[PDB]
Write a protein that binds this ligand. Sequence first.
Ligand code: PAR
Ligand code: PAR
Ligand code: PAR
Ligand code: PAR
Ligand code: PAR
Ligand code: MG
Ligand code: MG
Ligand code: MG
Ligand code: MG
Ligand code: MG
Ligand code: MG
Ligand code: MG
Ligand code: MG
Ligand code: MG
Ligand code: MG
Ligand code: MG
Ligand code: MG
Ligand code: MG
Ligand code: MG
Ligand code: MG
Ligand code: MG
Ligand code: MG
Ligand code: MG
Ligand code: MG
Ligand code: MG
Ligand code: MG
Ligand code: MG
Ligand code: MG
Ligand code: MG
Ligand code: MG
Ligand code: MG
Ligand code: MG
Ligand code: MG
Ligand code: MG
Ligand code: MG
Ligand code: MG
Ligand code: MG
Ligand code: MG
Ligand code: MG
Ligand code: MG
Ligand code: MG
Ligand code: MG
Ligand code: MG
Ligand code: MG
Ligand code: MG
Ligand code: MG
Ligand code: MG
Ligand code: MG
Ligand code: MG
Ligand code: MG
Ligand code: MG
Ligand code: MG
Ligand code: MG
Ligand code: MG
Ligand code: MG
Ligand code: MG
Ligand code: MG
Ligand code: MG
Ligand code: MG
Ligand code: MG
Ligand code: MG
Ligand code: MG
Ligand code: MG
Ligand code: MG
Ligand code: MG
Ligand code: MG
Ligand code: MG
Ligand code: MG
Ligand code: MG
Ligand code: MG
Ligand code: MG
Ligand code: MG
Ligand code: MG
Ligand code: MG
Ligand code: MG
Ligand code: MG
Ligand code: MG
Ligand code: MG
Ligand code: MG
Ligand code: MG
Ligand code: MG
Ligand code: MG
Ligand code: MG
Ligand code: MG
Ligand code: MG
Ligand code: MG
Ligand code: MG
Ligand code: MG
Ligand code: MG
Ligand code: MG
Ligand code: MG
Ligand code: MG
Ligand code: MG
Ligand code: MG
Ligand code: MG
Ligand code: MG
Ligand code: MG
Ligand code: MG
Ligand code: MG
Ligand code: MG
Ligand code: MG
Ligand code: MG
Ligand code: MG
Ligand code: MG
Ligand code: MG
Ligand code: MG
Ligand code: MG
Ligand code: MG
Ligand code: MG
Ligand code: MG
Ligand code: MG
Ligand code: MG
Ligand code: MG
Ligand code: MG
Ligand code: MG
Ligand code: MG
Ligand code: MG
Ligand code: MG
Ligand code: MG
Ligand code: MG
Ligand code: MG
Ligand code: MG
Ligand code: MG
Ligand code: MG
Ligand code: MG
Ligand code: MG
Ligand code: MG
Ligand code: MG
Ligand code: MG
Ligand code: MG
Ligand code: MG
Ligand code: MG
Ligand code: MG
Ligand code: MG
Ligand code: MG
Ligand code: MG
Ligand code: MG
Ligand code: MG
Ligand code: MG
Ligand code: MG
Ligand code: MG
Ligand code: MG
Ligand code: MG
Ligand code: MG
Ligand code: MG
Ligand code: MG
Ligand code: MG
Ligand code: MG
Ligand code: MG
Ligand code: MG
Ligand code: MG
Ligand code: MG
Ligand code: MG
Ligand code: MG
Ligand code: MG
Ligand code: MG
Ligand code: MG
Ligand code: MG
Ligand code: MG
Ligand code: MG
Ligand code: MG
Ligand code: MG
Ligand code: MG
Ligand code: MG
Ligand code: MG
Ligand code: MG
Ligand code: MG
Ligand code: MG
Ligand code: MG
Ligand code: MG
Ligand code: MG
Ligand code: MG
Lengths: 119, 206, 146, 123
Amino acid sequence: AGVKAYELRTKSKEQLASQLVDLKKELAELKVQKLSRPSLPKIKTVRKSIACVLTVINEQQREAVRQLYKGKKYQPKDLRAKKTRALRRALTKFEASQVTEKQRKKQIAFPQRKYAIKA
Amino acid sequence: EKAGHQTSAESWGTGRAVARIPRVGGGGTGRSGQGAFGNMCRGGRMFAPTKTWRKWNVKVNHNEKRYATASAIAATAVASLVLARGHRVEKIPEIPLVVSTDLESIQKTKEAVAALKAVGAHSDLLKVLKSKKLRAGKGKYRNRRWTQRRGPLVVYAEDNGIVKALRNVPGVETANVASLNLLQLAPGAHLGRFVIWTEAAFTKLD
Amino acid sequence: AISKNLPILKNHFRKHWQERVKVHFDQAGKKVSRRNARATRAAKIAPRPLDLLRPVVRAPTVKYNRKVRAGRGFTLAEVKAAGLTAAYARTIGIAVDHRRQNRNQEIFDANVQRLKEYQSKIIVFPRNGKAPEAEQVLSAAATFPI
Amino acid sequence: AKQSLDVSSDRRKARKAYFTAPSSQRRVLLSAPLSKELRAQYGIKALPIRRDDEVLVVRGSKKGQEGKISSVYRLKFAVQVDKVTKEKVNGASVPINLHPSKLVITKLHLDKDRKALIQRKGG
RNA sequence: AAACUUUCAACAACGGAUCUCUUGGUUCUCGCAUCGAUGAAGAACGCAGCGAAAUGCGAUACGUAAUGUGAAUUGCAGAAUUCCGUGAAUCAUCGAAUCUUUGAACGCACAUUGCGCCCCUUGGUAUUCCAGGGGGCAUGCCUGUUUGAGCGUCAUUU
RNA sequence: CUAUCUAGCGAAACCACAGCCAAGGGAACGGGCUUGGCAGAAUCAGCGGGGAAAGAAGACCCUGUUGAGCUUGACUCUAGU
RNA sequence: CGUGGAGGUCAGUGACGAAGCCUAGACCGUAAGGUCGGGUCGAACGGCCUCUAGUGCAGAUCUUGGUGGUAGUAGCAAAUAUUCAAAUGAGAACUUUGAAGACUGAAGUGGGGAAAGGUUCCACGUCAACAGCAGUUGGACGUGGGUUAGUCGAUCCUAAGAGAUGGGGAAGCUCCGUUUCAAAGGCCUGAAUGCAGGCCACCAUCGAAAGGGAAUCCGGUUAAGAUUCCGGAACCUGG
RNA sequence: GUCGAAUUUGGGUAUAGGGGCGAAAGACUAAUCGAACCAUCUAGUAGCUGGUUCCUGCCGAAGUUUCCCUCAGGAUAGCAG
RNA sequence: UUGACCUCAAAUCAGGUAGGAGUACCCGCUGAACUUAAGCAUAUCAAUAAGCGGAGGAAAAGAAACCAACCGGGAUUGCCUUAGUAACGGCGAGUGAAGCGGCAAAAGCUCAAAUUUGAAAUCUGGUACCUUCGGUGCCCGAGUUGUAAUUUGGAGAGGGCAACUUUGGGGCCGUUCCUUGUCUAUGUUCCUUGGAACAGGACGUCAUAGAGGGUGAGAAUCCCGUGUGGCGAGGAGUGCGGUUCUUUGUAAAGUGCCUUCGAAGAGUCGAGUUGUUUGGGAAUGCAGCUCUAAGUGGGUGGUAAAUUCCAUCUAAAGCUAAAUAUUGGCGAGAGACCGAUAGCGAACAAGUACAGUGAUGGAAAGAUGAAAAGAACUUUGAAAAGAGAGUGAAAAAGUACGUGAAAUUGUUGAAAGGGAAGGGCAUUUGAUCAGACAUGG
Ligand SMILES: NC[C@@H]1O[C@H](O[C@H]2[C@@H](O)[C@H](O[C@@H]3[C@@H](O)[C@H](N)C[C@H](N)[C@H]3O[C@H]3O[C@H](CO)[C@@H](O)[C@H](O)[C@H]3N)O[C@@H]2CO)[C@H](N)[C@@H](O)[C@@H]1O
Ligand SMILES: NC[C@@H]1O[C@H](O[C@H]2[C@@H](O)[C@H](O[C@@H]3[C@@H](O)[C@H](N)C[C@H](N)[C@H]3O[C@H]3O[C@H](CO)[C@@H](O)[C@H](O)[C@H]3N)O[C@@H]2CO)[C@H](N)[C@@H](O)[C@@H]1O
Ligand SMILES: NC[C@@H]1O[C@H](O[C@H]2[C@@H](O)[C@H](O[C@@H]3[C@@H](O)[C@H](N)C[C@H](N)[C@H]3O[C@H]3O[C@H](CO)[C@@H](O)[C@H](O)[C@H]3N)O[C@@H]2CO)[C@H](N)[C@@H](O)[C@@H]1O
Ligand SMILES: NC[C@@H]1O[C@H](O[C@H]2[C@@H](O)[C@H](O[C@@H]3[C@@H](O)[C@H](N)C[C@H](N)[C@H]3O[C@H]3O[C@H](CO)[C@@H](O)[C@H](O)[C@H]3N)O[C@@H]2CO)[C@H](N)[C@@H](O)[C@@H]1O
Ligand SMILES: NC[C@@H]1O[C@H](O[C@H]2[C@@H](O)[C@H](O[C@@H]3[C@@H](O)[C@H](N)C[C@H](N)[C@H]3O[C@H]3O[C@H](CO)[C@@H](O)[C@H](O)[C@H]3N)O[C@@H]2CO)[C@H](N)[C@@H](O)[C@@H]1O
Ligand SMILES: [Mg+2]
Ligand SMILES: [Mg+2]
Ligand SMILES: [Mg+2]
Ligand SMILES: [Mg+2]
Ligand SMILES: [Mg+2]
Ligand SMILES: [Mg+2]
Ligand SMILES: [Mg+2]
Ligand SMILES: [Mg+2]
Ligand SMILES: [Mg+2]
Ligand SMILES: [Mg+2]
Ligand SMILES: [Mg+2]
Ligand SMILES: [Mg+2]
Ligand SMILES: [Mg+2]
Ligand SMILES: [Mg+2]
Ligand SMILES: [Mg+2]
Ligand SMILES: [Mg+2]
Ligand SMILES: [Mg+2]
Ligand SMILES: [Mg+2]
Ligand SMILES: [Mg+2]
Ligand SMILES: [Mg+2]
Ligand SMILES: [Mg+2]
Ligand SMILES: [Mg+2]
Ligand SMILES: [Mg+2]
Ligand SMILES: [Mg+2]
Ligand SMILES: [Mg+2]
Ligand SMILES: [Mg+2]
Ligand SMILES: [Mg+2]
Ligand SMILES: [Mg+2]
Ligand SMILES: [Mg+2]
Ligand SMILES: [Mg+2]
Ligand SMILES: [Mg+2]
Ligand SMILES: [Mg+2]
Ligand SMILES: [Mg+2]
Ligand SMILES: [Mg+2]
Ligand SMILES: [Mg+2]
Ligand SMILES: [Mg+2]
Ligand SMILES: [Mg+2]
Ligand SMILES: [Mg+2]
Ligand SMILES: [Mg+2]
Ligand SMILES: [Mg+2]
Ligand SMILES: [Mg+2]
Ligand SMILES: [Mg+2]
Ligand SMILES: [Mg+2]
Ligand SMILES: [Mg+2]
Ligand SMILES: [Mg+2]
Ligand SMILES: [Mg+2]
Ligand SMILES: [Mg+2]
Ligand SMILES: [Mg+2]
Ligand SMILES: [Mg+2]
Ligand SMILES: [Mg+2]
Ligand SMILES: [Mg+2]
Ligand SMILES: [Mg+2]
Ligand SMILES: [Mg+2]
Ligand SMILES: [Mg+2]
Ligand SMILES: [Mg+2]
Ligand SMILES: [Mg+2]
Ligand SMILES: [Mg+2]
Ligand SMILES: [Mg+2]
Ligand SMILES: [Mg+2]
Ligand SMILES: [Mg+2]
Ligand SMILES: [Mg+2]
Ligand SMILES: [Mg+2]
Ligand SMILES: [Mg+2]
Ligand SMILES: [Mg+2]
Ligand SMILES: [Mg+2]
Ligand SMILES: [Mg+2]
Ligand SMILES: [Mg+2]
Ligand SMILES: [Mg+2]
Ligand SMILES: [Mg+2]
Ligand SMILES: [Mg+2]
Ligand SMILES: [Mg+2]
Ligand SMILES: [Mg+2]
Ligand SMILES: [Mg+2]
Ligand SMILES: [Mg+2]
Ligand SMILES: [Mg+2]
Ligand SMILES: [Mg+2]
Ligand SMILES: [Mg+2]
Ligand SMILES: [Mg+2]
Ligand SMILES: [Mg+2]
Ligand SMILES: [Mg+2]
Ligand SMILES: [Mg+2]
Ligand SMILES: [Mg+2]
Ligand SMILES: [Mg+2]
Ligand SMILES: [Mg+2]
Ligand SMILES: [Mg+2]
Ligand SMILES: [Mg+2]
Ligand SMILES: [Mg+2]
Ligand SMILES: [Mg+2]
Ligand SMILES: [Mg+2]
Ligand SMILES: [Mg+2]
Ligand SMILES: [Mg+2]
Ligand SMILES: [Mg+2]
Ligand SMILES: [Mg+2]
Ligand SMILES: [Mg+2]
Ligand SMILES: [Mg+2]
Ligand SMILES: [Mg+2]
Ligand SMILES: [Mg+2]
Ligand SMILES: [Mg+2]
Ligand SMILES: [Mg+2]
Ligand SMILES: [Mg+2]
Ligand SMILES: [Mg+2]
Ligand SMILES: [Mg+2]
Ligand SMILES: [Mg+2]
Ligand SMILES: [Mg+2]
Ligand SMILES: [Mg+2]
Ligand SMILES: [Mg+2]
Ligand SMILES: [Mg+2]
Ligand SMILES: [Mg+2]
Ligand SMILES: [Mg+2]
Ligand SMILES: [Mg+2]
Ligand SMILES: [Mg+2]
Ligand SMILES: [Mg+2]
Ligand SMILES: [Mg+2]
Ligand SMILES: [Mg+2]
Ligand SMILES: [Mg+2]
Ligand SMILES: [Mg+2]
Ligand SMILES: [Mg+2]
Ligand SMILES: [Mg+2]
Ligand SMILES: [Mg+2]
Ligand SMILES: [Mg+2]
Ligand SMILES: [Mg+2]
Ligand SMILES: [Mg+2]
Ligand SMILES: [Mg+2]
Ligand SMILES: [Mg+2]
Ligand SMILES: [Mg+2]
Ligand SMILES: [Mg+2]
Ligand SMILES: [Mg+2]
Ligand SMILES: [Mg+2]
Ligand SMILES: [Mg+2]
Ligand SMILES: [Mg+2]
Ligand SMILES: [Mg+2]
Ligand SMILES: [Mg+2]
Ligand SMILES: [Mg+2]
Ligand SMILES: [Mg+2]
Ligand SMILES: [Mg+2]
Ligand SMILES: [Mg+2]
Ligand SMILES: [Mg+2]
Ligand SMILES: [Mg+2]
Ligand SMILES: [Mg+2]
Ligand SMILES: [Mg+2]
Ligand SMILES: [Mg+2]
Ligand SMILES: [Mg+2]
Ligand SMILES: [Mg+2]
Ligand SMILES: [Mg+2]
Ligand SMILES: [Mg+2]
Ligand SMILES: [Mg+2]
Ligand SMILES: [Mg+2]
Ligand SMILES: [Mg+2]
Ligand SMILES: [Mg+2]
Ligand SMILES: [Mg+2]
Ligand SMILES: [Mg+2]
Ligand SMILES: [Mg+2]
Ligand SMILES: [Mg+2]
Ligand SMILES: [Mg+2]
Ligand SMILES: [Mg+2]
Ligand SMILES: [Mg+2]
Ligand SMILES: [Mg+2]
Ligand SMILES: [Mg+2]
Ligand SMILES: [Mg+2]
Ligand SMILES: [Mg+2]
Ligand SMILES: [Mg+2]
Ligand SMILES: [Mg+2]
Ligand SMILES: [Mg+2]
Ligand SMILES: [Mg+2]
Ligand SMILES: [Mg+2]
Ligand SMILES: [Mg+2]
Ligand SMILES: [Mg+2]
């Protein structure tokens, strides 16, 4: 039951804030009835919903902070490439590309010649 | 290598009224005190443990290799051998069976099958259909569950699709006359493979 | 110990030899994969024949000096005597060896001959991609034997 | 035989694969053949069996019996139909596990992507 | 003659040989090249309607998002079974997050759930004192920056 | 208080096979072999003659081109000096 | 002669019963062994020709596992001691209660704590195992309950001692060193916060539940907690 | 035996294996000390004990020679297949 | 008084980086003994184990201060062979490489020392601005104690001269590659046994599919697959062919000829000595201390020295693919392997339960049946259970569960028995088995 990922993404922050609070109100009230009854399997879907609400609220604020940093040279390490320690310190495609002026002319003067031999 | 040798076990020495074999340290578990290393003791190391560098492949002289493949062919001419080797060539017009080279182009099974049956290979075909049986040993779970006889050897010059046509038939195998494997020629080192030749193949032999 | 009448052997196996032991079980797969490694080179390399032209060289000492052998590269004298520069002679696939000077004419002749005669049977494609369809010969040395 | 360097014929991994197959993959191993009628109409031999399919037992001591699929028990590699039940001597009735391959589907419960599957298969 | 003892048989015990099983081991080959201060490896404690393990996870806790898939999961219960459907599932996939207390482990400690300092914000009169919330302060080194020291030292003094 | 008898509970040592002698010869001190004495179910409490009784691959002794603790103008070295 | 596996072959055997096992039953072989019947059994297995080995057991104070005689035997005898009745229970020398007889005799068989254990505490259920007789009982089994602090501890301080830091060794893991051959700071004031005041400056930290130390008592209360809860009366530090 | 001091003792702390510690016994250093405990080198070497797995058929020994830091072992010739 | 400079500090200065894990392979350091020598010290084990520092997907080595002595050869690595050879060795035990030759793979290279000196032409950052692995403009910083171009010995530079040759940067379809989805054959006919047909018989079918697994027993055709082809979706990215641009070029490269010039690495090479190592022997490498070069110089040329020549390379600075390594990691395919005392220790809640203060030590243990149909109900019992009765193909499968051996044990039956028992030959007695019976009714 409970909440749905796409429906939440439309609602505004300040509504989500209140969404949560009455889910916490419910889940709290659940745990009361829970110990007065022969179990209560129902409480699973609301505590999962709280995760979803909180996932979305996170999605927004992260994306929002993603915008505020767009195009800039220095972005929070939270939001960076990840990939690999070893990887992300490898030379950039630019840095590996550089070639000494002596060579760039040698790489022009006599670059590899495609040929063949018939008969 | 590590087998049966992963442990600290020392001997206990004489004087404990216990055999001198190495025995396991510590306590608190049945393993402690038990016999270690050694072939006689459970959980130990096997005597003279098998090595990979055991000599597996065997070298043969090339001329002697061809001498084997040669007689192996000549036996396919002898009616009594091929008969004795367990092949159903009982009737059939003549040995050798040489067949129309059009065979080499047959690309579909139902054709290639009835092609052989009509040239007189039907009886040693049906054989291999009736010889499939569960394997005798534990090789059953070693990826050989089944054991069957040998159908005829269909030998060509060029492969125009006879190979794909007979690749699914139970017991027939196909070979170029340029190669001619002795294993196929004398299965079990048994002379007299029943061999169906194509005229193109047969005229190539010399 | 020492018994009967037998030649004295020397078997160097006191050393933990069973540690460093190489079987080659891979001789099959190290060939099958040695082929596929060459097969797709020539694929990626397109009409070019997998190897440089290699010179004719005398080979040394008092034992193998009788025969003649493929050397490393064509050296310097023969490259200009073939009418082209070093730096270009490597672009058309040819072996250039800057050491090994020429102390022998009969070889120097045959080698420069081996160059022009190579330059003959080739076809060297232009800057562009418009070229005469290029059937690929894989061998070079066996196309220009010695 | 297998011509591919991908498929293996090794008996061990095969039985590992069957028994460790997940629920998604089991659903396909739980395919059932289609009845002479349903074969005609849809031009399709077999489809993964699913719940509410009416069915006909083609094998076993229940052969020639009919009912609707009560549940597909994928955990079990088995299937339950109503009307086919053991009555234990305590008076209770108990569902009898049957195999999809020993069943034939006499009516398909269809929805959109069950339709679109019958179409997605050529035939 | 019994009892007793011994030997044999039958049935019954004791025990798990043997036979047949094999989601395991073992060895050969083939292909690929990716751990970590963006917090790894490893550890601790937790997390399910009913779990002690194994397994999975991290207070969003046997999982949240995304994608596919097309109806189950199943020990009982429960459901919304929300089935021509943005949709079942202990499914596959995984590109988005969460990720307690730790650990090279970074304010200082650490047989302690011990103890400082800085910044923002909320409540208690509140610049100060107490409390809640949020973010912070390791080392060596490089490049840069800002601020300094030295009759090491060149000019200017006026 | 034990032992002893009973209800209940219930081990261990050891074990080639076993268990009456005399002599004989015998690896020169036999439960077994040879010749004699003999020889009758099933058993309980005691006992310390035998079982060359049990305990532990003799420590004494010798052997081993097997050690170790130790000593010294043995052989060969060495920190320090 | 026999065993595991391998190529070949009998189109060999078999759910109408393979293999195994049991047979004071049969036959063959000098023998290793082979063959058959009967029983029990449940899914595989054999003959011949070859190949190949982790291929044949009575011992090794062999290894592991199982089992005997010993044997219903040695034993269940230290710590003065038990008895009558009831209740409960299928069942009582052993449980509960009553009574009688006794003991430890406060340097205790009393009343608390430290280390250590870790729920053993308490209550209800409950006796297969465990309590070397017994068990209706238990420190067992099952299910639950339970440990409340400004003042009692920890926390703070320093002890023997340990240990970073400039540094100096060492190939290095690392060693030395604790004020040393170091530019080692952090207070109170005014002008909401920087400059102007200004003193002062050998020195991380860890190290005591028995050392040092801020400060609580009585009465009541639970099945099980109390200098902690409640009622009343106080005190100490910090605002 | 000693029992008001070279007394008994808790806890904290220090010294570690050719090392410690010793009012000295080769004592003690976790039931381990004339060199701890743990793993590895290690399946250490053994001229020395012990064991060494089916049947039948034929042939059939030696304890002597010489050399050996050789005397419980080898080489060597002899006997044997 | 004010402004720089050198050097040296500080900051919770702005941006970063190192640590740890892993360790099969890889580069180094350090470093044994057991052992062999039938003793033992050199030697051997071994330039090994243990200990330490540093990497990658490979590492390393590499464009020769090489090998040779030939008609010479020509970076490196690996295979084959040199070769159990040369040599080392109480010349004992033992040790032991190299040059050539065949093959695998092949790939070459750049700095330092030169005045741009008619122009620091070089570069880090900050910053706005965009087309963001970056691009421009501006600005602080670096730097003349040397940033750029140019040159690397195979050269090559300056001049002098004389003609011919040659180009750049973007992306827009398709291919290849990685992720990844999906389509693509043929009996469930008859009979018989059985609980179950997957069995045997009958009649068929498909096969570029008769690998394998699943399903109530030996299943090509019941299911998943297998074989052959076909169609999507998302990714890299410059290789392969195809697009059309831009105009790189008031740049760059190639090549001819004359004459002059041609910088080439020091507490290094080399040496002495010490130690160690090596097959390296009057000294193979390595390092300590001491000495310390030259520039037609220097190193090597495997017997030390003087002398005379000859041969061949250019140290003391640097980068690089492939062939090569791989008891680790990830993903696969296999075997004349092992079959629960085997095979890894672990087929299982196995590095677990348990032991130790600690480092460490470290097990046992798979199988009811097709399916729980897991024995309703009656009955004796305090109860655990027993007895009926049910399920099942079977209970001679009942969660002590497939088959159920031996030791050992209970009952029943048979026989024997005066201080063991068992064995050989023979026979009485009993029990028990047999082979031999068809020729006229
Ligand atoms: N087959 C029994 C063997 O017992 C061995 O283990 C046993 C031994 O280690 C040890 O047995 C000792 C024995 O070593 C020593 N030499 C004599 C001693 N009397 C024995 O004792 C053992 O056996 C006796 C006799 O049955 C029993 O009465 C006794 O209870 C038992 N502990 O006690 C263990 C348990 O009996 C091994 N597990 C294995 O070799 C094998 O299982
Ligand atoms: N004689 C009629 C023909 O038999 C042919 O084939 C015969 C067999 O080969 C086939 O039976 C199967 C077969 O389907 C499959 N592809 C192979 C399998 N081994 C065969 O199995 C057969 O042989 C085994 C022994 O091997 C025997 O037990 C039994 O006869 C049978 N099960 O079925 C037939 C029975 O003998 C075809 N079915 C067809 O051409 C036609 O029916
Ligand atoms: N100061 C160093 C920096 O710390 C940063 O990390 C900051 C936080 O993310 C980190 O927070 C830690 C957290 O890691 C951890 N899992 C939970 C913990 N409570 C937090 O701890 C922080 O606050 C506590 C308060 O009691 C302090 O005791 C602790 O020293 C401090 N690190 O503590 C830092 C702030 O004190 C970054 N990891 C990095 O840039 C760098 O290492
Ligand atoms: N010494 C006479 C000859 O000089 C020649 O000198 C070379 C160069 O100096 C000469 O000059 C080339 C010129 O060819 C070409 N077409 C134009 C190019 N800019 C020049 O290039 C040269 O000169 C520039 C200055 O202009 C310098 O930076 C530098 O020396 C070089 N790049 O081109 C020659 C190419 O090899 C060669 N070294 C050789 O032929 C011979 O020695
Ligand atoms: N007695 C009535 C009920 O029996 C039930 O139990 C039934 C079974 O589980 C139990 O089975 C027992 C078994 O437990 C035990 N291990 C022994 C035996 N294998 C079985 O025995 C049973 O089956 C046999 C065979 O037909 C009958 O002869 C016998 O009477 C019967 N008790 O026997 C019972 C049937 O008589 C439950 N225990 C309970 O509901 C109640 O006691
Ligand atoms: Mg083992
Ligand atoms: Mg003994
Ligand atoms: Mg066909
Ligand atoms: Mg087998
Ligand atoms: Mg078998
Ligand atoms: Mg297997
Ligand atoms: Mg198999
Ligand atoms: Mg090549
Ligand atoms: Mg697959
Ligand atoms: Mg395998
Ligand atoms: Mg009922
Ligand atoms: Mg099933
Ligand atoms: Mg859809
Ligand atoms: Mg459509
Ligand atoms: Mg079975
Ligand atoms: Mg509950
Ligand atoms: Mg789970
Ligand atoms: Mg349900
Ligand atoms: Mg249900
Ligand atoms: Mg999943
Ligand atoms: Mg995830
Ligand atoms: Mg974390
Ligand atoms: Mg942390
Ligand atoms: Mg910390
Ligand atoms: Mg905070
Ligand atoms: Mg007595
Ligand atoms: Mg008694
Ligand atoms: Mg006792
Ligand atoms: Mg005992
Ligand atoms: Mg005793
Ligand atoms: Mg006398
Ligand atoms: Mg006598
Ligand atoms: Mg006497
Ligand atoms: Mg006597
Ligand atoms: Mg005796
Ligand atoms: Mg006798
Ligand atoms: Mg006699
Ligand atoms: Mg006499
Ligand atoms: Mg006596
Ligand atoms: Mg005795
Ligand atoms: Mg004793
Ligand atoms: Mg003793
Ligand atoms: Mg002795
Ligand atoms: Mg002894
Ligand atoms: Mg003694
Ligand atoms: Mg002596
Ligand atoms: Mg001697
Ligand atoms: Mg000694
Ligand atoms: Mg065999
Ligand atoms: Mg085997
Ligand atoms: Mg076979
Ligand atoms: Mg066979
Ligand atoms: Mg049959
Ligand atoms: Mg068998
Ligand atoms: Mg018999
Ligand atoms: Mg029978
Ligand atoms: Mg039986
Ligand atoms: Mg049988
Ligand atoms: Mg079965
Ligand atoms: Mg079966
Ligand atoms: Mg063996
Ligand atoms: Mg055996
Ligand atoms: Mg035995
Ligand atoms: Mg024995
Ligand atoms: Mg016993
Ligand atoms: Mg007895
Ligand atoms: Mg008793
Ligand atoms: Mg008694
Ligand atoms: Mg006693
Ligand atoms: Mg008493
Ligand atoms: Mg009473
Ligand atoms: Mg009592
Ligand atoms: Mg008294
Ligand atoms: Mg007192
Ligand atoms: Mg108390
Ligand atoms: Mg209690
Ligand atoms: Mg107890
Ligand atoms: Mg008791
Ligand atoms: Mg009892
Ligand atoms: Mg206090
Ligand atoms: Mg403190
Ligand atoms: Mg101090
Ligand atoms: Mg220190
Ligand atoms: Mg100092
Ligand atoms: Mg300030
Ligand atoms: Mg105190
Ligand atoms: Mg109390
Ligand atoms: Mg109060
Ligand atoms: Mg005295
Ligand atoms: Mg006195
Ligand atoms: Mg040590
Ligand atoms: Mg010593
Ligand atoms: Mg010391
Ligand atoms: Mg003393
Ligand atoms: Mg003494
Ligand atoms: Mg001990
Ligand atoms: Mg001790
Ligand atoms: Mg000693
Ligand atoms: Mg110790
Ligand atoms: Mg210990
Ligand atoms: Mg051994
Ligand atoms: Mg060794
Ligand atoms: Mg030896
Ligand atoms: Mg001796
Ligand atoms: Mg001598
Ligand atoms: Mg002897
Ligand atoms: Mg900063
Ligand atoms: Mg590291
Ligand atoms: Mg390392
Ligand atoms: Mg020796
Ligand atoms: Mg020796
Ligand atoms: Mg010695
Ligand atoms: Mg050495
Ligand atoms: Mg090492
Ligand atoms: Mg890496
Ligand atoms: Mg590679
Ligand atoms: Mg490299
Ligand atoms: Mg060079
Ligand atoms: Mg070379
Ligand atoms: Mg030497
Ligand atoms: Mg000598
Ligand atoms: Mg020698
Ligand atoms: Mg050596
Ligand atoms: Mg060497
Ligand atoms: Mg810039
Ligand atoms: Mg910039
Ligand atoms: Mg040109
Ligand atoms: Mg049928
Ligand atoms: Mg099957
Ligand atoms: Mg059939
Ligand atoms: Mg199959
Ligand atoms: Mg199959
Ligand atoms: Mg199919
Ligand atoms: Mg299909
Ligand atoms: Mg397919
Ligand atoms: Mg140089
Ligand atoms: Mg060294
Ligand atoms: Mg030297
Ligand atoms: Mg390099
Ligand atoms: Mg490279
Ligand atoms: Mg391996
Ligand atoms: Mg490893
Ligand atoms: Mg393969
Ligand atoms: Mg077993
Ligand atoms: Mg095992
Ligand atoms: Mg077992
Ligand atoms: Mg076994
Ligand atoms: Mg085995
Ligand atoms: Mg084990
Ligand atoms: Mg356990
Ligand atoms: Mg241990
Ligand atoms: Mg079992
Ligand atoms: Mg009743
Ligand atoms: Mg009752
Ligand atoms: Mg019954
Ligand atoms: Mg039932
Ligand atoms: Mg029935
Ligand atoms: Mg039956
Ligand atoms: Mg049965
Ligand atoms: Mg059964
Ligand atoms: Mg049951
Ligand atoms: Mg049970
Ligand atoms: Mg049992
Ligand atoms: Mg059973
Ligand atoms: Mg079974
Ligand atoms: Mg039995
Ligand atoms: Mg008597």
